[PDB]
RNA sequence: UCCACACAAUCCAUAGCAGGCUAGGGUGCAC
RNA sequence: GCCCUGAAAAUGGAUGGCGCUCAAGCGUGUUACCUAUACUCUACCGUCAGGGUGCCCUGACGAGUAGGCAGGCGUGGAGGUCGUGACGAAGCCAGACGUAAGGUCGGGUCGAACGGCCUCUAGUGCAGAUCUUGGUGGUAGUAGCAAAUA
RNA sequence: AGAACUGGCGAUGCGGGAUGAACCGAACGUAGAGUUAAGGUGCCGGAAUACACGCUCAUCAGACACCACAAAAGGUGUUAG
């Protein structure tokens, strides 16, 4: 002000614009690589089966997974592999969210979720091949060769997604 | 506000200009003078001599003579030096003097409290009795 | 490189706002003929500012 | 040397400036001449050119060439300013195109790319380096700058 | 323990001696209070005797320069030794004088070892002896001090402070 | 051998300075490196103006006066640790553990069976051919310097003769024990190996 | 013929991690822009990762310390690569480009 | 006194990720 | 061209070294790489252009002894102004910055005094001068304490 | 030794050249990223055991300038012209 040497006064919230250009990636990036995003399941392995949704990229292959457990639970991962492909549900990440923290439901409706999918990858894979899917699921890396096929489809299996990476979460602070 | 002060321990030289051929001799001060003479490496100005003292080190206005808390200190003397404090709150940090005793630092202390300028004052205050 | 350039910078400006005032009228005054000379047209008090800085040799008796 | 460096404002390594077609700055540039690399560059690179590497005027510091400054400013008062008439201006080197050819003052172009942009600093297009006149090796050299 | 350098022990605890102001080479001593370090009282006492009857060296594991070498090393083999008799004399008074304080304290015969010796040399003292040519050198003298404090917890406070890293995450 | 942790080199008609270039900066790489068949190796040029030189470096090894070093290195083992010395920054602590990481060892030492290998075209077979101002075994010049060497060829010719009778029923076994394809087969899997990589 | 052999060659550092309890060593994570084709990483690894430091830009301690990594273990087996530190490398100087 | 050894500081089910149970030749072992 | 021949020197071998010889030689062309504080760019400090409201912004230039000039830091004391003190000055470790001269506080010592600001003045800032004086280490547990033999 | 004309050193860092006031590149506030000069790419030592070819076999020889030597005579049926 006035006189005197001067000290502040705060500010913000502003800019500013972009917008054909905001969008460039936001589908895409899948593109270069093929796939659809996450969720992704356990083919193989086991012919029945499974599901998971793909927090994190520690890098690519050293991957999070996770699901349910704030007392005893249920397990969880930090892997460089061992078992996973693609379905076709697709978010608008591709693969972060995370810990290893979920609950209410979530064990359960993952697994009633997964039997779609799989019920839909099992003639596909008898179409192709099973004892063979393993060694694909094995990789992890991945991705680019084959990005197919149908399996039908959504918008259940994206609600579960969008909750277990909200759920992912915590705050509420604890002890143990 | 800013995470300027990130560039100010970032920027350096934090080198510490010292005397040198200090830590030879005890007696060579550890503060800094010019060196002289030609034949000295570090009038030459290289890289690993040490760099010398110039402005173009200096850091940027606003952060200059600030904390690495970024809030900015004045030496307070008493009760009535606070009162100056008060309006900046959340800009100044108090940094309490030492010549100060320990029954004034008490009033001081814990008016200070009260006005939410608390950096300094309650560490000092820690120290001095507790 | 260098020159012109060097000798540009190796120079110097330009007046200069006089050396101490003993009087504060004349520190203010100095002052207020550089306040009317941006605010409007006048250019003989923007010179007058600079003699006015100036100490025994720029100062005239008339 | 230098004081004729100075006259072509030729201020520092990686300086440029445009000269005319003529004999006399041609013999000027004989002195100068161990000193430069020199050409015609065509008429694209030099639209390159100065995008990358033009600056404003005096009366204002140095604002760029850049696409808001040229079209609103430049004084000019031979012709017209904006980007693509002051360029052709130039280039065609007609009235007052040397007055065109007083820019604000020199471009300051980037190191050579790559050192394609430097053949040897010892030898002539004629030893089989750098130095003098070439028009091809100019247009590459130039894209080089960038 | 006197007006002191550093205990770091305990009164109840511990004996004390101190010797105040000797002229005796102040290398010598520091040699010997080196070698003497952790041990009793009795094993030192006979040390001692030992040494200024030539039968047990002194350890000059510093202190050099024509000293006598490897007479027996005794304590390890190491070629410098000595058997400085008349520092070992002061010593001998010393331990002797905490034995005592040790004693009076009613602490045991078989009560424990050395925790902690010192030798300073506190000033040197000022002397001149002329020589030739019309020129002066100096012949002086260190007063040395030695501290001694002798400690009932070697052995124990060993095993029961026993005593030092631990931990982790709160 | 190209790994991390192996390593062993078969010195046979390898070029000595060549060897030496590969096995600096694997050392520096951090590797432990075992150098076999050391008399074998052989450096090009004649002989005669080859021995002039280390001639000089056995009349430098007469003197300092004192004792403790300098040194001229009789024998191909030693020949060879000589010429790592230089090779590699011998200033320097990291220099000098590199070379702390070098053994090597004339004929074969104690055994090791597993094959020691030939380094990308180290060989002088190629290397010479154009030609050959001679061309000098280790073995060669060490025989004129003295002996750590009598002793090293007279076990490389013992250590040649015992595995060289081991080779010969190696081989033999090996051929029996594969001709599978001596084709046994076709069987549709074939087809497969011809598809599979193939696609 | 080959094998890799060939300077393409850029790279990031991701993050040097100069981790124990006392137990870990160290270890350092790389990902190369494009390059090693799926199978240039597999058949090979180890394929040893120069990089040159060198003055950038003002004064870097401009050395003779000419850096070599090593691929451990891709972690990312198309992109992403497992590489650890030994040496020295100069300071904190992840980032920094891959190269040879 | 010290040798050898524990402990910790330095082709199938399919949970639900992962495993890893159990119905029905290749290679590690005190050799 | 090459090359040998001409071609001999003193403490020990080198072209910087190892020392390769269809080259790791040398010459002819040629491809790709590497590489400075350079050059470009990002951020920002001074000067000068200048602009604008004790303050903010644009762009250019910007190593430095002798040396000129200009701004600033610190000292003992005076006066006035703002105060500070029975745990002050002072000390040593540290803690925060100011490129920087210095700066501020804390440990835990200490047991009476001390800052700031303005204005001034001066027994006013040191590594050194075969500099002064005092103190202290290595030299050392070293030379000497030996020619009437008592 | 003593002039002229000029650049540098003095008073000019940094990069190259084994080291090395005045040789080359380069004129330097700070810090970073990029890319380059000079000059270099078997190892030490970035970076090629590069590509087309030709000579040389003496260890010539790894050298702009430099306390880098080598001549007259040059043989010569060495190779080439």
Redesign the interface.
Known sequence: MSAQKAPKWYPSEDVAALKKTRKAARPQKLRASLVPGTVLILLAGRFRGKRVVYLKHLEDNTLLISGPFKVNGVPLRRVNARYVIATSTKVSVEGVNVEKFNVEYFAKEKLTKKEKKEANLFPEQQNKEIKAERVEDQKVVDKALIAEIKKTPLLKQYLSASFSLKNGDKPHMLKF | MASLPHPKIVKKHTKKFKRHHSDRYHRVAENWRKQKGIDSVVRRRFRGNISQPKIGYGSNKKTKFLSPSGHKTFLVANVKDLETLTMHTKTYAAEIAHNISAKNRVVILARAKALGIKVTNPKGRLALEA | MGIDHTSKQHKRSGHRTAPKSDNVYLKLLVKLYTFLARRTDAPFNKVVLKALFLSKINRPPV | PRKVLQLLRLTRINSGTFVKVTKATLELLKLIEPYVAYGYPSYSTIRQLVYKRGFGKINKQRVPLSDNAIIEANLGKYGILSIDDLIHEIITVGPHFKQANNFLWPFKLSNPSGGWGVPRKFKHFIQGGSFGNREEFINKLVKSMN | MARYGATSTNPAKSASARGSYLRVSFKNTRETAQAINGWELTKAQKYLEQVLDHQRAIPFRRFNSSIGRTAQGKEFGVTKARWPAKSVKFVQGLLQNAAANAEAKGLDATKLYVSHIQVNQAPKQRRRTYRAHGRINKYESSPSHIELVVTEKEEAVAKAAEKKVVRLTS | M???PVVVIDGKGHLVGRLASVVAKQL???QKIVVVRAEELNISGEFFRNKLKYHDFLRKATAFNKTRGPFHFRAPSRIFYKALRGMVSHKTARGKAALERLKVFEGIPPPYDKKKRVVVPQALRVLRLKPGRKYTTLGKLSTSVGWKYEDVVAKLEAKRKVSSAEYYAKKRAFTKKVASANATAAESDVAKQLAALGY | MAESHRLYVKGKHLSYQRSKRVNNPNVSLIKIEGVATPQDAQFYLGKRIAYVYRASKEVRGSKIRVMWGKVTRTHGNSGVVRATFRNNLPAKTFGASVRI
Request: net charge negative; no cysteine.
């Open positions: 190209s790994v991390e520096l790489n951090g």
